[PDB]
Amino acid sequence: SNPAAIPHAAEDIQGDDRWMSQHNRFVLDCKDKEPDVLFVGDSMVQLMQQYEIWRELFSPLHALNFGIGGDTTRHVLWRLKNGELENIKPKVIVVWVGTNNHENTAEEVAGGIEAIVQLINTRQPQAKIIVLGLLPRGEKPNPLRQKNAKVNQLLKVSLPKLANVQLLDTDGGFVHSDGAISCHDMFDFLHLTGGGYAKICKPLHELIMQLLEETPEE
């Protein structure tokens, strides 16, 4: 039984109960909104909303964003299991989680995502799922650039089984020849800049648009 795929709510250790605050906000959003597209995941998903490119691309798509920073597969699971998947019937769901899963081997992580996907197409059989691949990180090459890469590998293999899922492993030129990531692309070598997301979002939007143009009687 793989730890990365056991649902688990993040205990607030700080005092301001912010994690639950956000989750509730979403549940509440699930009660009376009705999106075509749903983004779930971690900071990568959360931060995307903050940039000009979100109101430019996905806002008009009737998109919801259920991202929380620093969330792991375990957290996203729990969130999805505890009511972020009720009442809504999105046409497309975008999942983007994993890069915060230190403490798990690549393999376990892939399992996590896979479990997430499983849950999704259980509660939302109609939804077509995109899983964004894990992005490189760190200024210069390292163990984690490697980890994320494996995850992508295993996903390319294990996602074309399992219904209505594809992996979109974007690669904008985030690593150059000398193997360095420019802080013009990742301001802290992890989270993307406006510029960065534009490299990710262009193709993502392009894909969703495809998937939406596929079937429209909901």
Binding site: D32, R55, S59, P60, H62, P216, E217, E218
Partner: protein, 310 residues
């Protein structure tokens, strides 16, 4: 007495903390009202723009607003499943009306200011007695969410609007329904009845040897109709996203429109054309209203403003 629907916004009123849901002109005073997910009703001054008053007391969201003929009672709608009746002696709530089992997304005071109509995710339309807060009639009908209800100038009839892609016209007395208007491709979000301009026949007046209504959908299509025959007669083939408001101009020269294409449209059903466009907001335009008397239009969106236009 021709009219100007356009320029660049001549007042932008910020104040709400959350998307605006409906905008409404007062029948008498130089004031206009706005509802939001706040869950607050707010009152401006459209001639001047001033935070005038705030009306508090709903729990979850304010979806619709409707003034009585006299401009002395205001009904509101919410995601609390309530229907608050307010006194415009200025302040207090009068009654709170409980019935619907879910979100209540439309309300209207009927012309003989003696009844209220509401519509819900219930799949329900209910009819309440204003002075007793009783639920009197319940219209079972569509298989899905009901999005809007409108009275017929005469009071005799009701137009409903829903997720089953349908427009129903019901007889308020018998609770039978004269028509089900079917030929929409996606959820209908809007209904308006035609007024002092049944001249409009001109554009489609043949056949051989009546009452009308517009519907805006998530087709991005506004469809004209008559209830009588069940035929739609037009389709305003339009701009880019979910349509959100429909509105026959004071007379019947133009139809006005707003939608999720961050934009307000004035059409020329003077032969199908769409005679002008204004980008009004930095996120979906949620609703509009035209004044029947004065040179002003209001417009509220998700960027949490109310914009006034001349």
């Amino acid at each position: 007495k021709e009219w100007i629907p356009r320029p660049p916004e001549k007042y932008a009123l910020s104040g709400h903390r959350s998307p605006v849901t409906r905008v409404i002109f007062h029948p008498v005073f130089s004031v206009m009202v706005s509802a939001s997910e706040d869950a607050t009703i707010k009152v401006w001054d459209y001639e001047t723009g001033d935070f005038e008053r705030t009306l508090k007391g709903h729990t979850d969201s304010v979806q619709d607003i409707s003034f009585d003929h006299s401009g002395k009672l205001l009904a509101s709608c919410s995601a609390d499943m309530t229907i608050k009746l307010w006194d415009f002696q200025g302040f207090e709530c009068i009654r709170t009306m409980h019935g619907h089992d879910h979100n209540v997304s439309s309300v209207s005071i009927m012309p003989n200011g003696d009844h209220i109509v509401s519509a819900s995710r219930d799949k329900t339309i209910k009819m309440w007695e204003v002075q007793t807060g009783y639920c009197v009639k319940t219209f079972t009908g569509h298989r899905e969410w009901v999005r809007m209800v409108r009275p017929n100038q005469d009071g005799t009839l009701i137009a409903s609007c829903s997720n089953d892609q349908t427009v129903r016209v019901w007889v308020v007395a018998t609770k039978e329904c004269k028509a089900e208007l079917r030929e929409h491709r996606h959820v209908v979000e809007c209904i308006s009845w035609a007024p002092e301009s049944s001249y409009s026949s001109i554009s489609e007046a043949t056949g051989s040897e009546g009452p009308f209504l517009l519907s805006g959908s998530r087709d991005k299509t506004i469809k004209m109709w008559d209830v009588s025959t069940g035929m739609c007669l037009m389709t305003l083939v339009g701009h880019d996203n979910w349509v959100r408001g429909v509105l026959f101009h004071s007379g019947g020269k133009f139809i006005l429109s707003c939608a999720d294409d961050k934009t307000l449209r004035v059409w020329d059903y003077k032969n199908k054309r769409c005679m002008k466009t204004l980008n009004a907001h930095e996120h979906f335009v949620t609703s509009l209203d035209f004044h029947k008397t004065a040179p002003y239009v209001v417009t509220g969106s998700v960027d949490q403003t109310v914009k006034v236009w001349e």
